[PDB]
Design a protein around this ligand. Structure first.
Ligand SMILES: N#Cc1ccc(O)c(-c2ncnc(N)n2)c1
Length: 294
């Protein structure tokens, strides 16, 4: 727009391209996400608009919503780096455990806040987690799959990431619960620790079977109602659960215990963000400074 002198394209979210821009008037540097379409669910503009009211240190602030010319623009506070880039940058040495712990703790605080306000993220992934030089990490993107359903791509026919999708979504559950975010965060936690995606599926069924190969094919014992799920097939192969010590080595038992609770198959047994914050894994949590090269 003419109010912003674009600095450059920062990326390509599942809901449009993101740019870094400076407000010629206020001098403010912000992140501008433009959403892609001839109607524009005003019921969404309303919901989205509510999100501006979300204020928490671990949630990227939504500054403004701009509806114009069949295009929707979301103006967000800007942060210099996303966790995907940071993990890639730290791939040789690994993110120190105290930093991993600090990030997980902050992310759970952010989720506990959103969830207590009846807001689900639904598409958590490293690229959607932003960090700054002061050790903070914040949740970005957000209430969109709700206020938009679910597009088949991102915008430029880009490939949607399934790696962090909870099993109930993959099995066709039509009602997501806050548990889907805990699952995604659990996947992210594991990835920070091992430096490799936990479940790198390249299709919906491959995503599901990678989950099954590791945690065991679910059954009515561990997940009451699973065999009645929309996309459940009795023909699914039945894999034995793998010892957890093999999944996220060399993470200690407090961490493995917490992860196991975030990855429970039954959305109802899956730990809540609030309960996770009380887990013993966070007894010695601190707030370290990351080595960020911008
Ligand atoms: N949605 C959103 C959103 C909001 C604020 C942001 O700063 C970013 C972002 N995305 C990628 N890289 C960097 N540096 N920032 C994305």
């Amino acid at each position: 727009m003419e109010n912003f002198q674009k600095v450059e394209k920062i990326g390509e979210g599942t809901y449009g391209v993101v740019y870094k821009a400076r407000n010629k008037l206020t001098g403010e540097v912000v992140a501008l996400k433009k959403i892609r379409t001839e109607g524009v669910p005003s019921t969404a503009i309303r919901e989205i608009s509510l999100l501006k009211e979300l204020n928490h240190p671990n949630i990227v602030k939504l500054l403004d919503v701009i509806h114009t010319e069949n295009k929707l623009y979301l103006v967000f506070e800007f942060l210099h780096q996303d966790l995907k880039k940071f993990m890639d940058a730290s791939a040789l040495t690994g993110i120190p455990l105290p930093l991993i712990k600090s990030y997980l703790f902050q992310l759970l605080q952010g989720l506990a806040f959103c969830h207590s306000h009846r807001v689900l993220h639904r598409d958590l992934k490293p690229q959607n987690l932003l960090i700054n030089t002061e050790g903070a990490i914040k949740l970005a993107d957000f209430g969109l799959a709700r206020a938009f359903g679910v597009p088949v791509r991102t915008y430029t026919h880009e490939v949607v990431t399934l790696w962090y999708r909870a099993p109930e979504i993959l099995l066709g559950c039509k009602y997501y619960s806050t548990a889907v975010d805990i699952w995604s965060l659990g996947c992210i936690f594991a990835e920070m620790v091992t430096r490799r995606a936990l479940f790198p599926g390249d299709s919906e069924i491959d995503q599901l079977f990678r989950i099954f190969r590791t945690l065991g094919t679910p059954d009515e014992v561990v997940w009451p109602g699973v065999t009645s799920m929309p996309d459940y097939k009795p023909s699914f192969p039945k894999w034995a659960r793998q010892d957890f010590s093999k999944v996220v080595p060399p993470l200690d038992e407090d961490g493995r215990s917490l992860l196991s609770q975030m990855l429970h198959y039954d959305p109802n047994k899956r730990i809540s963000a609030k309960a996770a914050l009380a887990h013993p894994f966070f007894q010695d949590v601190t707030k370290p400074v990351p080595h960020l090269r911008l």
